[PDB]
Amino acid sequence: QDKCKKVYENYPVSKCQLANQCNYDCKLDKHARSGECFYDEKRNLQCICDYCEY
Numbered sequence: 001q002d003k004c005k006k007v008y009e010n011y012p013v014s015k016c017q018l019a020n021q022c023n024y025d026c027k028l029d030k031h032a033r034s035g036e037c038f039y040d041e042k043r044n045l046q047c048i049c050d051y052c053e054y
């Protein structure tokens, strides 16, 4: 799979900082298996949904 992960674009950064938010919104809003917040190389937080793994 080349497309396991995918940013949730314009996802609130404030929500990214809080437990469960990105994970459950990824599941709720995108039907994804999971999500997590990570920085990127420009050092800003993003919510990355994962469609392969829980």
Ligand code: NA
Pocket: 018, 019, 020, 021, 023
């Ligand atoms: Na969490």
